[PDB]
Structure formats: C-alpha cells, structure tokens
Ligand binder design. Structure first.
Ligand SMILES: *[C@@H]1O[C@H](CO)[C@@H](O)[C@H](O)[C@H]1NC(C)=O
Lengths: 49, 125
C-alpha cells in the first residue's frame, strides 16, 4: 500500500493495491505425435532446380 | 564433381611403414576439414584422425603412436604415413570430408562425401 500510494504514511481506509494471480503449477506441451523427420534434405540438396 | 580417390594399399610386412594417399579432385583443402577412418572386417568404422585447413592435426588417442596425417596443398592431396603395422591394422582405409557447414541429414559419422577406400593387409607374405 505504501508503494502504491507512493507515501510512507497511509491514512485510514481501504486501498486497492494489486490483483492476486494464481501461479502456474506446471507447464504442459501438447504437439501431434508424428515422429518422421521432415524431408527438407530432398528440397535443399536436389541436383536440379 | 567432388570425388575422393585413395591409393597405396596392399601387402605390407609387420613392423614396417606404409604411406597412403588421398589425392582429391573437385575441391581444395584450404577451407575444408578432412578425416581418415578405418574399417575392420569384423568391426565398424573407426575414426583415425582429422586434418584441419590451418594445419591442425587430431588423432585417435588409442592410435596416436603410429599414424601421421600431412598435406600437400600444391598437389591438393592428403597423406597418411602409417608405421609399425600389426595384425589388427588390416583395414579398408576411407578418406572423407567433414560436413562442418551444413547437416542435411542426422548423419552418425558426420561426413557428406566419402572415398572408395584402399585395403591394407598385414601377414607373413
Ligand atoms: C547431397 O547431394 C550430394 C550430391 O547430390 C550427395 O553426394 C550427398 O550425399 C547428399 N547429402 C545427403 C545428406 O543426402
């Protein structure tokens, strides 16, 4: 409250200071289960363009 | 066309010295790293050593005592002066370029062009 009002003395009352946010407990990554490497070698190493 | 040709294999006595060549065509050694790899009849490809463009040599630490890799940039060829060839030194010796710049495939051996390799055998006669 002192940091929000930018004062070392706070008068009597109610003061909106910040918003409580629930912290993310885990991190989830969901990508498709495809595993075959993509043939960029065919594109980039071709003999003739 | 980038093509690696090796020469100098054949019969060689135990305890002698034998010089191998990697006369290269289609590219020069001023900007490429070059490696020597051996191949046993019953085992896989075993890396022998590597010559860098600045003259820096690295070797197999179980094989440092008896190999020597040198260049001849005037003849754009690589040399391998091997000494004290024993029974397990019978191998087919490939000379290959290192694909430092790009990795198109996930190569286990990390080389983009290979040589045909020359076969060396060590026995009584
Ligand atoms: C790229 O192409 C060259 C010649 O077309 C070939 O020698 C080389 O093996 C190819 N690389 C891969 C990773 O397929």
């Amino acid at each position: 409250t002192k940091c929000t009002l930018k004062s070392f003395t706070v008068e009597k009352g109610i003061y909106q200071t910040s918003n409580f946010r629930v912290q993310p407990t885990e991190s989830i990554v969901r990508f498709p289960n495809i595993t075959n490497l993509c043939p960029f070698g065919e594109v980039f190493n071709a003999t003739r363009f | 066309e980038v093509q690696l040709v090796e020469s100098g294999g054949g019969l060689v006595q135990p305890g002698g010295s034998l010089r191998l060549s990697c006369a290269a065509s289609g590219f020069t050694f001023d900007d490429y790293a070059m490696s020597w790899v051996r191949q046993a009849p019953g085992k896989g490809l075993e890396w022998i050593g590597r010559m860098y463009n600045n003259g820096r040599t690295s070797y197999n630490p179980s094989l440092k005592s008896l190999v020597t890799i040198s260049r001849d940039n005037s003849k754009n060829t690589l040399y391998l002066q091997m000494n004290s060839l024993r029974a397990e030194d019978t191998a087919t010796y490939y000379c290959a370029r290192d694909n430092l710049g790009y990795r198109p495939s996930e190569n286990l051996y990390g080389m983009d062009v290979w040589g045909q390799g020359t076969t060396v055998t060590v026995s009584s006669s």
